[PDB]
Structure formats: C-alpha cells, structure tokens
Amino acid sequence: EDPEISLADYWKCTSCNEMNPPLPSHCNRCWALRENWLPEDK
Amino acid sequence: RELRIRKLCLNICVGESGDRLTRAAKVLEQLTGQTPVFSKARYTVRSFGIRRNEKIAVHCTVRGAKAEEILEKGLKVREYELRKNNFSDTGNFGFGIQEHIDLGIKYDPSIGIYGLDFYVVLGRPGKHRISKEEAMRWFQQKYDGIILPGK
Ligand SMILES: [Zn+2]
Ligand SMILES: [Zn+2]
C-alpha cells in the first residue's frame, strides 16, 4: 500500500495479534490502544 | 549529519464520519498547510460503532522544512522524551500526544480536543539499511532527545 515503509514498521496488537500499520495507534481489528505510544502520566 | 527526515505522517482518529471528523481535517489543514486525506475503516467493529469502509480518520504527509517544524512542536510537547518502544526495527519512529492545542492551535469549545499521531520515516540523502540504533542516536544527538528504556 505504501512503498516508503515495510512490514517491519507494523506493530502487533497484544490483545488480538493483528499486525497494524504504523498509523493509527489503535488496533484496526479490536480497537485496543498501542502501549507506550502516549506520554506516561504521573 | 548524514541522516535526514524523508517524511512525517500525521493522523487524527475520530471513529465516525460527521462534524467532529471534518473539524479534525481543518485542524490538520491549519497545522500543516496541506489537505488531509480521510481514512476508511478496514473492518466493522460492533462494540465501537465502527462500520467497514466508513470515513473515520484524517491523515497528512509532510516533507522538508514543514516536517521538521511540526516534529519539533510534537517533541516539545513530549519534552523531547520518547521510549525505545516508539522506535521501529527499520530506523523509523513515531509517537502520540493527547491534545493538539499543545502544538499552539487555539482551543475552541465548539471544536473540542484531538489526540494526534506522528510517524517519522528516516532516510539517507543519496540504500544501506538504517538500524533501530542509528535512528536512536540520530534522535538523541539532533534533538538532545531522551529515549527511556523499553516497557
Ligand atoms: Zn487488536
Ligand atoms: Zn482510528
């Protein structure tokens, strides 16, 4: 779909194991958010 | 001194078509000076009200001086601090911010608040692969950035 990135840019959802494109940062299958993407609150 | 930004991708998720989506387009236009492209749902997702093929998000690609500038705004919001998780095995990296107003866009109670996703694809100014570690020390040196340990 995009020639400037590879599958190695994909992230694996840990809730359902879907391989997801770099963006968005929620899983396209189950909507679970990607971890350690957003700044951690104190 | 020999590693460059190839592009910066930006994305705002809404989840459905309508007012809030079209306002997320504007925010990207104001922020970016380009017209964003609406993304469609890959799958319907019942429990989140998502329907396959519906317009649900907006994204924009920026290059050159514009990309550097927007990245810097994003990094400043993040206080120049990412995690090793943010860095792909390809030598690219991305991150999110909770509120778009922190890039310096005025808050409108009509508009609301948007989260924003950044993805940065690196390259060489010329095909030799960029490792995860090169991109990491590039970020560390060029932005005096901090990469927290992997969680
Ligand atoms: Zn998932
Ligand atoms: Zn989305």
Side-chain angles (χ1 to χ4, degrees), chain A residues 2-39 41-42, chain B residues 2-105 107-126 130-151:
Chain A
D2 178 352
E4 278 175 299
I5 56 157
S6 60
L7 257 276
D9 285 300
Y10 285 55
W11 61 279
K12 190 175 199 144
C13 175
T14 57
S15 303
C16 91
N17 291 336
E18 176 87 354
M19 289 303 178
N20 287 279
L23 300 195
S25 64
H26 55 75
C27 174
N28 296 263
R29 223 219 312 255
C30 74
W31 245 238
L33 295 162
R34 178 190 181 156
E35 277 139 297
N36 307 132
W37 184 250
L38 266 24
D41 285 52
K42 66 216 76 194
Chain B
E2 63 168 359
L3 216 52
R4 68 167 281 123
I5 300 170
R6 167 166 279 284
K7 71 186 179 181
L8 172 72
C9 308
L10 300 160
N11 168 94
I12 295 170
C13 292
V14 177
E16 59 180 6
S17 207
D19 284 349
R20 188 86 173 333
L21 212 201
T22 39
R23 294 197 284 263
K26 250 151 194 182
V27 162
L28 277 177
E29 275 180 312
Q30 297 164 182
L31 192 266
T32 218
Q34 333 262 239
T35 36
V37 169
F38 300 95
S39 301
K40 319 254 267 187
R42 300 194 60 86
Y43 315 108
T44 107
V45 185
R46 182 184 166 274
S47 60
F48 283 90
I50 316 298
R51 202 165 322 102
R52 182 191 150 83
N53 280 325
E54 217 212 346
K55 293 179 281 178
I56 58 162
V58 275
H59 68 271
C60 207
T61 303
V62 281
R63 311 181 173 270
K66 183 89 273 196
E68 292 191 67
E69 187 196 305
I70 292 153
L71 182 56
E72 284 170 38
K73 288 167 174 181
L75 289 170
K76 149 74 163 21
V77 176
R78 291 292 303 262
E79 293 164 298
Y80 297 96
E81 179 206 278
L82 304 170
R83 288 258 168 206
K84 192 178 186 175
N85 302 63
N86 288 300
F87 289 78
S88 292
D89 281 285
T90 48
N92 307 322
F93 67 99
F95 62 91
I97 60 162
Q98 264 104 174
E99 311 192 355
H100 70 106
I101 60 168
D102 295 0
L103 285 348
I105 307 275
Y107 171 75
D108 194 322
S110 271
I111 268 81
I113 295 299
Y114 294 96
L116 188 65
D117 289 315
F118 296 68
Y119 202 77
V120 185
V121 10
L122 265 12
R124 300 194 205 272
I130 305 151
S131 65
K132 190 195 197 102
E133 292 72 27
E134 293 178 281
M136 279 172 79
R137 69 177 179 264
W138 178 92
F139 166 84
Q140 285 166 331
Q141 287 181 13
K142 190 174 173 184
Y143 298 107
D144 201 52
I146 291 164
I147 294 160
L148 261 26
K151 272 185 165 193

